[PDB]
Structure formats: C-alpha cells, structure tokens
RNA sequence: GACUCGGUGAAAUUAUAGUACCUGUGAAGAUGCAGGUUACCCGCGACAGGACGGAAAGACCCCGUGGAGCUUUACUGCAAC
RNA sequence: GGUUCGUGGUAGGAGAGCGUUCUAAGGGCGGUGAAGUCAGACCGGAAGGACUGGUGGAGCGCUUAGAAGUGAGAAUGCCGGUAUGAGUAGCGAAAGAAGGGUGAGAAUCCCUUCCACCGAAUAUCUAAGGUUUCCUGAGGAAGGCUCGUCCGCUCAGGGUU
RNA sequence: GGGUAGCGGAGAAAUUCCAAUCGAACUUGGAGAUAGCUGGUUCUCUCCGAAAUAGCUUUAGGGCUAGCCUCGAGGUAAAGA
RNA sequence: GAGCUGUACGUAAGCGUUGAUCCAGAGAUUUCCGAAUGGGGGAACCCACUAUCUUUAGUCGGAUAGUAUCCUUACGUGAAUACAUAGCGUGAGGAAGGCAGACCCAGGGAACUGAAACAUCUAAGUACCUGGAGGAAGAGAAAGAAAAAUCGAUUUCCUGAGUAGCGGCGAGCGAAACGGAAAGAGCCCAAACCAAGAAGCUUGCUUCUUGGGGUUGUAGGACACUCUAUAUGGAGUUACAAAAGAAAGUUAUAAAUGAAGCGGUCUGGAAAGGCCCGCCAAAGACGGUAACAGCCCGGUAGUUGAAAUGGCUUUCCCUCCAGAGUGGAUCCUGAGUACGGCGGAACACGUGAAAUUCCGUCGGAAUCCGGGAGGACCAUCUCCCAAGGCUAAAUACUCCCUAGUGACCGAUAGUGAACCAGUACCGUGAGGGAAAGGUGAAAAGCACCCCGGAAGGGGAGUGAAACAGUUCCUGAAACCGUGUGCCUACAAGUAGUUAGAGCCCGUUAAUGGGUGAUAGCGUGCCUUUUGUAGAAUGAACCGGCGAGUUACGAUUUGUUGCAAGGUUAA
C-alpha cells in the first residue's frame, strides 16, 4: 500500500501466459558424468540410483557446462548440441531414448 | 480398623507412648479410638449438664488408630495383625 | 432554619501543601517564579473576589474517506403496480 | 595489559544484566525455627543482594540450564480498604404538659388528667396489592434518621370455622 | 378485563408515546464490530542518536518511497572533510 | 464384621454377632405438575362421565379401571343420491415431548467488517432460526480418474500449492488429479421372461397383485441347448433375507489376601526429622498419622474373588441358499427422463470461450446399428453405461463414566460458582448476576472468682501457643490513637537540598544515628506539546489486579549437523 498513490503493480501491464503442456527437463552437466567408470552405459535409471537426478521432470537433458574425460555411452531424452559433440569428442555415443 | 472396642492396645506415639490400655470406644468415621487412662484432658464443665455441681473433669480423649498396636496375650508384645479363616468366619492373627 | 448545648451523623471534591499583597515575569491573566511590601500562633460567626472553583472527555466551531434521521429530477437497487 | 580519542540526550537502534513463578539435574538449609512479615547505621556501578534481631510456625534457597500469566505510579482503569470535607449538612410538613408507674437505665414505653389537631377525614367499610406484617409471651445485637424498657424488628408459641 | 410490537405499533400531529430508554424500545447473540482518534503500556545500566523535509496521495493531525538515526558485513588511486 | 440412627454445634427414644449401620446386583413402592392425553386451567389446581365394587334409611361419601388428538390399518354403520362415496363409530398398531449451548445433514439466511470511501466482491453460506436425525452423520461400488499406458467404490491424513485458476484481474478467493498413507467390502433391484391367480371383458388378447428369474459394457441378461449341485457344501442378522435361543469363556458393576522396625538415642508439645543400627521389596504409588514414614494405619506389587444383572467373544442351535459353459434369430437393460432455451444457484471458477452439478419454468431425445464423458464445439480415439436402492472401517464431536496425566490455577487466580450459586440481589419480562476458604494435633471451645443489666473485660484454668478464644494460620499499607528525644507562637514555606550551631543518642563502627536555630539554592509527577510550575490533561490515599502473546507462513542474523547436496511428511 502507498497511501492511495496507485501501487507499483497497477502502474505496469500483465505479461504472457502459462503453457498447459510446458516440459521442464532434469539437467545433467557433463562434469558429474566423470563420476562414472570408463566404457560404462549411463541410463536415466543409473542417473537416479547413483543419486545425480532424484526427480526426472519431463526427462533428462545433458548440457555441456564442464568438460568430460571418460569414454561413456550416455542415453537421455535430450542433449544440447555442445553436450552431444563433447560426449563424442571424448570417444562415446549418445542415444535419444 | 485393625483394633476394636475391648482390645488391649499399646500406644506407640505421643505423650503416652509405652502406656497400654483397653479400647473403651472406636470412632471409625474419624479413625480415632478411646483408650482407658490415655490422653487425659481437663474438661471445664458448666453445672447445667448431667453433673449438678459442674467442675474441671479429667476424662480420656480419643487417640488416632494408627498410634496404637494390638497386644497378643501369648507374647504380651505389640504385633501387626494378619487375617486367617478357621472355616465359618475369619479371625485376627499375630505375626 | 441559622447560632449554643445534648443525641445521631452523610456528600460532592481532594498531587503533596507551613497556601499574603503589589509590580513584573512566564504557554502572552501566578498563593507557589523575581524584586519589593506587609504579616505573632489557633479558632468561631459572616461575605463570595480568586483558586481560569465543583458538576458534565463543549451541545457552539472545525476535523473523521465516524454514525444516524430526513429529502430529491444524486447513483444503484427492491416492493408494488 | 598499555596508549590515544571519547562518555548531555527525546523518538529510536544496539549491547550487557537484575529480579519474579515454574521445571530438570546437582548440591544444600530448615522445629536448635522454612517462607512471609517488621526493624536496622551492611554490600554491589544500577536493577538489586546479604547479615543480625523481633514476629511467624513449615517449608525454602543455591549452582547450571530451560520455560514464561515475568516487574506498574498514572488508563475520568477494575475490586477492596481507609481518609478529606466534619462533629459539618441533614435528622422528611404538625402541640404538647405534668403527675404516677416500670426498669440497670426513660423527653421518647405504660397509665391518668388537662391541652391541641382531623372530622366529604386524618373517621367506618371494602376491592386491588402485600403475604403472617395479626395475637400472646420473651428480647434489645442489628433495623428504627435521637432514645428505647418499645416496635410493622429478633425468637418462640398461637390465630382465619 | 382485553387488542395493536420495533423493517413494527399508536399519534385532535409534538419527532409525540410504546415500563424513569425513542429521528426508531429492551435483551441476548454476530462480538474482542470497526476507531488513520484520545488515553494507557510495568526492571536497570552502557554505546550511538534523529526528524518535524521532498515527492505522490478523497491527501493534508494518516500513509508510502526518498532524506536524516542505528546494528552487521564488504570492498579499495581512499573515494570523505 | 462392630458398631449404628446423614450434615452440623443437639436433646430424646432405640437398634445391632439370632449379624445391624455400610457396599454392589436385582426387585417392589413411586403423591401432584409437566408432551400431559377425560374436560378445563393463571404448571404443580379445579370439574367430570362410563363400568364394576363398597358405605348409608337414602341423598351425601369411598375404591379400582377406562375415557385426548392425529396417522396407518381392519371391521361396522352410512348423506345429498340409485349403486356408492364422503361422513360417523369401534378395535388394533404408531406418533407426539425432551435434549450435549457439541459433532452431522437439510430448508431459510444477515450485518458490522475488509476493499484504507463504496455499489460488484468480502465478511459467509458464517451467526442465527427451522426441520431431520445418528452414534456418528454425509459419501460410496464408475455413464469415474486418466492419457508416464494405465488405474479400479467412498471417506480421512500428508503432498501437490498459495501452484493452476478466479477476481471493480482490486481487496481478496483458491482447486484437483497423479504420488505417499490410515482403512478396506461389497451388494440388492427395475426390465425381458416363467408360473400362479385376479380382473378388464380390448371377450383368449391386454394391465394389476404375489412368487420365481435377473443385474451388466470390445457388453450382461432373458431366451435356446449342455454339465454339476436341490443342503454335498456355503452363508447369515454391520449391507448382502430375518427372528429366535442355549451353553462355555471373558470383562464390568461389591470385595479378599498382602512383606518388613512399638530398634536405640537426640531435640521437641508431638518424631515420620538428626545421629547410630537393622530389615522388606514383583510392594520406595498415593494419602493419613501431633513436624518430612517402604517397615504405624488405609493401602501399594503380586495373587485370589461374584449370588445377581449387563456387555463382549466363541461354539452350538436356529434360519437361509443354485452356479459354470456354449451361442447372438428375436426380446430387455430406469422418459416427461437425458438434454436444450430462459431465470438462478453450486462448482476455487463472479457468464465468462464455460465444460461439470442442481433448482424453477417452458420445450423435449436416442433407447444397442444405442447412450455419456475426456473444460465451448466437431471429428477420431480412449474410458465409461445415467435417469432405482443399500452398505462396515479409516473421520467429527463429548452432556457423561472409569483410570490417569500436566515446567496448568491456588481464593481479585482457577469455573459465574472451593462456601447450600445460577443462590442473594436487580429487572414487568426476556434477561443480568455477585460477595463469601483457614481455631487447634485434639474441643482440651476458657470450671471458678471479680466489675458490668448485658456486651465486654481482668484473673484462674486448657493448650506447644489464647497477642490460636467459634470465624479464631500469617497479618503489609493506607488510616486512627497513646507516650515522648529534638524543634516550633516576627514568620511568606513544591517543603527538600547544601552549609550549620545547639541538644539528644550510641551503630551491621562507619571521616556514625535523631532533631534542626540560622544561611544559600530550589516552580511536584505524568501525559501532550514549537513551548507546560503551569491558570492544559490524569491521579483522594494505600493494596491487589491491569497492556507486543501464541499458531502457522515469509524474510534476515546467530548457532549446530551434513554438504553438491540437504531434509523427510502423513
Ligand atoms: Mg450538636
Ligand atoms: Mg510577557
Ligand atoms: Mg501576572
Ligand atoms: Mg514575590
Ligand atoms: Mg495553582
Ligand atoms: Mg470549572
Ligand atoms: Mg471533547
Ligand atoms: Mg462531543
Ligand atoms: Mg560531556
Ligand atoms: Mg549517554
Ligand atoms: Mg532493542
Ligand atoms: Mg514459594
Ligand atoms: Mg504478613
Ligand atoms: Mg503481567
Ligand atoms: Mg492504584
Ligand atoms: Mg464547613
Ligand atoms: Mg453551620
Ligand atoms: Mg443544623
Ligand atoms: Mg419527623
Ligand atoms: Mg372540606
Ligand atoms: Mg403487633
Ligand atoms: Mg438507635
Ligand atoms: Mg418489647
Ligand atoms: Mg419513557
Ligand atoms: Mg464478526
Ligand atoms: Mg469492544
Ligand atoms: Mg553522543
Ligand atoms: Mg485519487
Ligand atoms: Mg503527530
Ligand atoms: Mg448381613
Ligand atoms: Mg388432564
Ligand atoms: Mg476503511
Ligand atoms: Mg502391612
Ligand atoms: Mg524430649
Ligand atoms: Mg506444625
Ligand atoms: Mg504433615
Ligand atoms: Mg443455468
Ligand atoms: Mg462461485
Ligand atoms: Mg460435453
Ligand atoms: Mg431447465
Ligand atoms: Mg453433458
Ligand atoms: Mg478436450
Ligand atoms: Mg480448465
Ligand atoms: Mg446402462
Ligand atoms: Mg472466584
Ligand atoms: Mg489470601
Ligand atoms: Mg467471581
Ligand atoms: Mg475475628
Ligand atoms: Mg520566635
Ligand atoms: Mg517585625
Ligand atoms: Mg482530577
Ligand atoms: Mg526468524
């Protein structure tokens, strides 16, 4: 309340809408994949057991942030272009389940 | 109550401990007893009442029951009381 | 009726009070502050100038985005027709 | 531990504490006198705390922590007590007097006589309403605007066909 | 002896009366209504210490942001005086 | 198992081991009023009638029983009106009223208030009124939730989430499903059709009653055949049909038994306390007892106990009972219903793009080749099968009962009420509504003397104490007095303070205490104010009571644990 001066929130317009079908992915940066042993097949189920992602909202997306050392086989619902390149640049294969 | 009128009790507490007497009356609603020659009090009595010369009367006042123990004629000592059944009615027993 | 004596015995009010006057000063009108001027201690009958005396959180006046009653071509309604 | 600069203060911010009730644990006091209460010229920078003695007559400190119905001088605060005004206002329309009696005690109760007042009422019935106030015998704390031996008051008995 | 009852009665009309209440009875409840108003708010010491302004406001004795106070922390061509 | 005839401070007359008083179960009695019910009535009263009996010479009296109204239902009478209906009468059943100021469901339904005004909105479907209840109610076995590809009645909790939304898009309002739990349980009809009547006479077709049958979705049933049951088995009074009994066990409602110190000594009125010795403990709970007790008393642990009544659990009795398969000719599967328009409401959802659910009104389907839903609507797909009913548990609340608990109160508190309190008292009434606890261990409650009419005192006595004396533990302050150390009748006083003689004392022993001639200085406290000694406010005084709290969220600082992790809720 501003003692009758029109409050800030009414001086400015409402914006946008909420999407009923909004997908939010559980994010996994490369750095945490170094945790795993070399030549290992990283699944969502393996990513929740280990305790890296607890709730797999809409799916698991792999993002680049950090740098991967080990040569893995990572299967996730989505990969960033950079993440895919980086997983491969190390000497691994990405699959999109 | 562990004693009743007629019982020979020893007094174990008060100005009269060590003294024994007969139980003249029991007041179980007050949990008190009247022992012969125990707890004598001087009652300042007006003539009016049954006592046509009044006067300072010296009589027994009631003691609390928990202040007397029963006397066993065999030993002649203060004893706690047990209850044992002969067959028809139960009876008090010394220990 | 008042007053004196004998009997009985309230109340409003009340920060504590050993509670003068004048001129001044000061929230601008002082028993209470300053400078003076008066004044032995305690009462009783009287009078009301002051204690901005008592009584009543001013009814006047204004204020409150307080009430309430009333009015109408104020607004929105409702009954009834 | 020194040095330097500081230490007026309302609203208000910050800090450290005192004391109250209760709980826990530890350790105590107490009928050779607990708490409370009264008094004192004692101690601490403050809130406060002891000691000694009286009263009191059975419970209470201390330490560390914990929890709060935790601190009053003001609210025309609420309840209680007690002042002040003050031996003051008042004692509610009115005619009494003396003698005798009763009694611990009498202007005030009883009796007598005179006086005075109402008399289309201040008399006699009676409805309402009240509900025992009626009668008798005791009483005199309170009530009665004084007094009181008296009473519509107190206590007993009675009483309405 | 009865009747009319509160968003109502009754009024030879005064806002008059409806149990010492009437521009809308009384009582209980909603109810601790609401009160930008008035009053009040209880132990101690130590350190610091304002404001009574601007802007906007059915706003003007209220409020909000800023200004001015305080506590903590940070950071350096020290930018303050 | 020895006393008893209630409080409470009595007098009297009595009872009791040939078992009283007392405790528990079960009976009997139970005036009048009150729904109040034979009629009336100003509750606790008045007045009857009809039978039967009783009393008297008969009136006059007495006793017992019946006699309200409505609903349902038999039967009988029976009008206008012929049959008949209404009406009237009799007999059965049933209802009526109350309340736990709670919880539940329904009908009806505010305003203050918030929105810094106010009208939509909020408060709130709350308060309140009315009805219905039940021990719980409501809900409930999908015309559901969904769309991880599946789940499988309802309810309640955690979560989702202050999210999605709603909203003068303001103030505010605010889900649900998924996920995790508690608890779990499923059933009966209507209709096809079959049988038996009954009627209408549509006169062999139709609709009405009773019984069988039958209960559901890529369907189920009827209907055809077929296999086994016709109590072999199974199931029950908590739904799934409904009444009955027994017996045994167990719990409740009285009780019983129950270890160990009269230990010594000290203080004391008294010992349970101190000191010194013992002992019991499945018992060191609590209370009482002359101060604080495991061993004094009632008890406590443990172990026993019920004639009678009630509850529960089992078992028996009793009662009741068909359930698989195969086809798909036909038939059935809830109509003034669903739905729609108009007007409202409920849905978190304010008419909105408004699905879903309900009410009024009007219109009004399909009916298995069928119908509904998936948030306007259409198509596809998916999931369901409405217009009938029942259903325990997990949930809510507490007038009560039993046993317990409390960093809850301790007499201005705690209930309004510790006490004869919803009393006294106030009010026409609805209604409002107090104050008021403590002798002592024990009455031992003050014989007797004295003054006084008494009250009240002073002795004497009791008692540990009477300065504990029947309202009597303690006994503060205001306030009222008596006594007297210092001062005071020439003084002008916010009453003190600083200096200070004199006089009087003698301490928590201190560069002490009381008083104060005289001298200097000095306008209370609080509130509110630019500014108050204020001629502004508040307080007569003393005492007690009397105001930032808690819950749930947000945020920030401190602390601690763990740390790319941390943490669980129910
Ligand atoms: Mg006089
Ligand atoms: Mg001037
Ligand atoms: Mg002047
Ligand atoms: Mg002067
Ligand atoms: Mg003055
Ligand atoms: Mg005045
Ligand atoms: Mg005023
Ligand atoms: Mg005014
Ligand atoms: Mg200074
Ligand atoms: Mg300072
Ligand atoms: Mg602070
Ligand atoms: Mg205490
Ligand atoms: Mg005291
Ligand atoms: Mg307080
Ligand atoms: Mg006071
Ligand atoms: Mg005077
Ligand atoms: Mg006079
Ligand atoms: Mg006079
Ligand atoms: Mg007179
Ligand atoms: Mg005349
Ligand atoms: Mg008389
Ligand atoms: Mg008198
Ligand atoms: Mg008399
Ligand atoms: Mg009037
Ligand atoms: Mg309200
Ligand atoms: Mg109020
Ligand atoms: Mg400063
Ligand atoms: Mg504006
Ligand atoms: Mg101001
Ligand atoms: Mg017997
Ligand atoms: Mg009757
Ligand atoms: Mg407002
Ligand atoms: Mg024993
Ligand atoms: Mg001794
Ligand atoms: Mg004692
Ligand atoms: Mg004791
Ligand atoms: Mg509609
Ligand atoms: Mg709505
Ligand atoms: Mg639809
Ligand atoms: Mg319609
Ligand atoms: Mg529909
Ligand atoms: Mg859709
Ligand atoms: Mg939607
Ligand atoms: Mg169907
Ligand atoms: Mg009370
Ligand atoms: Mg007290
Ligand atoms: Mg009270
Ligand atoms: Mg007294
Ligand atoms: Mg002189
Ligand atoms: Mg002179
Ligand atoms: Mg005043
Ligand atoms: Mg916080």
Automatic annotation (TrEMBL), chain B:
It comes from the Bacteria. Part of the 50S ribosomal subunit. The keyword Mitochondrion does not apply. The lineage of its organism: Bacteria, Bacillati, Bacillota, Bacilli, Bacillales. Belongs to the universal ribosomal protein uL24 family. InterPro entries: KOW, Rib_uL2_dom2, Ribosomal_uL24, Ribosomal_uL24_C, Ribosomal_uL24_CS, Ribosomal_uL24_KOW, Translation_prot_SH3-like_sf. The keyword Amino-acid biosynthesis does not apply. SMART domains: KOW. GO terms for biological process: translation. Residues 2-29 form the KOW domain. Gene3D superfamilies: 2.30.30.30. GO terms for molecular function: rRNA binding; structural constituent of ribosome. Pfam families: KOW, ribosomal_L24. One of two assembly initiator proteins, it binds directly to the 5'-end of the 23S rRNA, where it nucleates assembly of the 50S subunit. GO terms for cellular component: ribonucleoprotein complex; ribosome. This is Large ribosomal subunit protein uL24. NCBIfam families: rplX_bact (TIGR01079). Keywords: Ribonucleoprotein, Ribosomal protein, RNA-binding, rRNA-binding.
């Amino acid at each position: 309340f501003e003692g009758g001066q029109l409050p800030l929130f009414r001086r400015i317009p409402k914006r946008g809408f909420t999407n009923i079908n909004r997908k939010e992915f559980a994010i996994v940066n490369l750095d945490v994949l170094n945790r795993f042993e070399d030549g290992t097949e990283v699944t969502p189920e393996l990513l929740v057991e280990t305790g890296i992602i607890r709730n797999e909202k809409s799916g698991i997306k792999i993002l680049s942030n950090g740098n991967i050392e080990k040569k893995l086989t990572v299967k996730a619902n989505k990969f960033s272009a950079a993440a895919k390149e980086a997983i491969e640049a190390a000497g691994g294969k990405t699959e999109v389940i | 109550m562990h004693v009743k009128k007629g019982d020979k009790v020893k007094v174990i507490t008060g100005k009269d401990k060590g003294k024994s007497g007969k139980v003249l009356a029991a007041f179980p609603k007050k949990d008190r007893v009247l022992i012969e020659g125990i707890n004598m009090v001087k009652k300042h009595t007006k003539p009016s009442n049954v006592n046509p010369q009044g006067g300072i009367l010296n009589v027994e006042a009631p003691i609390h029951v928990s202040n007397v123990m029963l006397l066993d004629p065999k030993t002649g000592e203060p004893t706690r009381v047990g209850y044992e059944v002969k067959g028809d009615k139960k009876v008090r027993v010394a220990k």
